[PDB]
Structure formats: structure tokens, C-alpha cells
Amino acid sequence: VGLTTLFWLGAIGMLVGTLAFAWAGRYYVTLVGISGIAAVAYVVMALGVGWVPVAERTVFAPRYIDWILTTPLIVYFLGLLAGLDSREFGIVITLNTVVMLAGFAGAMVPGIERYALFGMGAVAFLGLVYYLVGPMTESASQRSSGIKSLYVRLRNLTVILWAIYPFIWLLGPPGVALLTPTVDVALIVYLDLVTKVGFGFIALDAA
Ligand SMILES: *C/C=C(C)/C=C/C=C(C)/C=C/C1=C(C)CCCC1(C)C
Ligand SMILES: [Cl-]
């Protein structure tokens, strides 16, 4: 099982999700963007494009462009469910972008300064979790019982799984380089598929 095989698997999974969401169908267009963008990133990586050598590790640049564009769309989807005003959107999307940019920069820096960048993303992530579990949950409470229930289920899926990524990053090549690239990639392909396509199908089921 090679890296390219794992990338192709993620590509296929994102494509199936993309077509499913497009067929079912603001919410549906967002889900198409979430999995559609990831599909492209995985194909590019499957073709061997964007594999950037950094010191002694290999960094996958399309992954971070993907995350920077798709994760704010996931937060946007959750913000619509919760009924956020256009100002609360700005805070959480700003916090999200800090996490994503810090990870991208830390991965691309060869020296230990990269752990300083990782730490900053961790701090901003804790602030993002606070807004999901607190203010956004208060806001979602004002909606119908079914919408509130859908928000809580997507929120917990999001919080629990997103919290695993920084550990995979740190244990993988970008960090202490403990986990091997193949295992590290396999774990992230699984998480990407669940936080995007699984996320989407839970929404379809409730609709
Ligand atoms: C579809 C892709 C998803 C949901 C990716 C999520 C990625 C994260 C939640 C990554 C978080 C990170 C930290 C909290 C600190 C810095 C390193 C990151 C980017 C792995
Ligand atoms: Cl990476």
C-alpha cells in the first residue's frame, strides 16, 4: 500500500460525496465545496504534485490549501445551523484561519521554530472550541428542536475529530517524525473523509 494508493482512495471518497451532495440538492452548495475542493487536492497529491521536501521530511502542500479553504466552510455550515449574526461568523472564521495558517507555516519551516507555530495554532484552536461549545450552542438553542439536535450532533462530531488532527500532525513527519508517512497519511485520509463526507451524510439524513 503506497502513498499514491491512499491519495487515490481519498480522491474517490471525496468524489462520491461530492456527487451525492450535488444530487441531493446554501447548505447543499457548501457541502459540494467542502468535498469538491478536497477531491481536487487528493487527485493532485495522488499524481505526485505538491510533495515538497523540507529538511528530512516530505510535506504535502495541497493538503494545507485544502484545509484552509474547506475548514471555514465547515464552520460556516455550523454557523448557519446555529443562526449566527454576521459578526460572530467573523470571529470563528478568523480563529479557524489562524489554526490552518499556523499549521501550514509550521509544516514548511525546517527548524524548531515550527513548534512555536504549532503552539500558536493550538492556542487558537482552543478558542475555536470554546465558541463551538459555548456561544454557538447558546445561539443554536433559539432554533427548532430538530435544528438544535442536528447542530449538536455535527458539533460533537466536529469537536472530537478535529481535536485528533494536532496529535496526528505532532506524532507524524511534521513533528517528532515518530509515525511513518504511510501510517500518518492513512490516518488523515480517514479523518478527512469522516469530517467532510461523513459530516455531509449526517446532514442529508436529517434533511
Ligand atoms: C477537512 C479537513 C479537516 C476537518 C481538517 C482539520 C484539521 C485540523 C483541526 C488541524 C488542526 C491543527 C492544530 C489544532 C494545530 C496546528 C496543526 C493543525 C493544523 C494540524
Ligand atoms: Cl503534511
Q: Tell me if 67 CB under 6 Å of ligand 1.
A: yes
Grid cell locating 125: 484552536
Report how far residue 18's alpha carbon sits from residue 188's, in angstroms, rounded to the nearest whole number.
19
Way the structure was solved: X-ray
15 lies in some domain:
no
Which of 44, 78, 96 lies closest to 151, judged by CA? 78
In a domain, 6, yes or no: no
Contact (CB, 8 A) for 14 and 35: yes
* Largest CA-CA distance found in the chain, in angstroms, rounded: 53
- CB 148, CB 108: distance < 8 Å: no
Taking the mean position of all CA atoms in its chain, how far away is CA 147?
Answer: 22
Query: 96 CB less than 6 Å from ligand 1?
Result: no
**Ligand 1 probe mutation, 76, 125, 165, 194, most atoms within 8 A of CB:** 165
Query: What is the Cα 111 distance to its own chain's centre?
Result: 25
Q: Is residue 10 part of a domain?
A: no
Question: Backbone phi, then psi, for 60, in 5-degree steps?
Answer: -105, 100
CA distances, 38 to each of 65, 140, 147, 153 (Å): 9, 28, 27, 23
Closest CA to 30 of 80, 100, 96: 80
Ligand 1 atom with the smallest distance to the CA of 196 is 1
Indicate whether 178 belongs to any domain: yes
Please give all residues whose CB falls under 5 A of ion ligand 2, grouped by chain where several chains appear. Answer: 59-60
Q: Which domain holds residue 107?
A: 51-206
Find out whether 18 and 36 touch, Cβ atoms under 8 Å: yes
Q: How far apart are CA 116 and CA 122, in angstroms?
A: 10
How far is the C-alpha of 140 from the C-alpha of 134, rounded, in Å?
Answer: 10
Cell of 203: 446532514
Q: Is 7 in the pocket of ligand 1 (CB under 6 A)?
A: no
Residue with cell 460533537: 156
CA–CA separation, 124 vs 201, rounded Å? 28
Give the number of residues written for the chain: 207
Residue 13, C-alpha cell as written in the block: 471518497
Q: Which CATH number is 168's domain given?
A: 1.20.1070.10
**Domain assignment present for 2:** no
Number of domains within the chain: 1
Using H for helix, E for strand and C for coil, what is the string for the chain? CCHHHHHHHHHHHHHHHHHHHHHHCCHHHHHHHHHHHHHHHHHHHHCCCCEEEECCEEEEHHHHHHHHHHHHHHHHHHHHHHCCCHHHHHHHHHHHHHHHHHHHHHHHCCCCHHHHHHHHHHHHHHHHHHHHHCHHHHHHCCCCHHHHHHHHHHHHHHHHHHCCHHHHHHHCCCCCCCCCHHHHHHHHHHHHHHHHHHHHHHHHHHC
Atom of ligand 1 nearest to the CA of 168: 20
Within a domain: 44: no
Q: Quick one: 171 exposed, middle or buried, by C-beta within 10 A (0-12, 13-18, 19+)?
A: middle
Atom index in ligand 1 nearest the CA of residue 117 equals 16
What is each CA distance from 18 to 28, 36, 162, in whole angstroms?
10, 5, 21
How deeply is 203 buried, as exposed, middle or buried, from its count of CB atoms within 10 A (0-12, 13-18, 19+)?
buried
For residue 8, being part of any structural domain is answered with: no
Please answer whether residues 138 and 153 qualify as being in contact, where contact means their C-beta atoms are separated by less than 8 angstroms.
no
In angstroms, what CA-CA distances link 28 with 104, 119, 201? Answer: 28, 34, 11
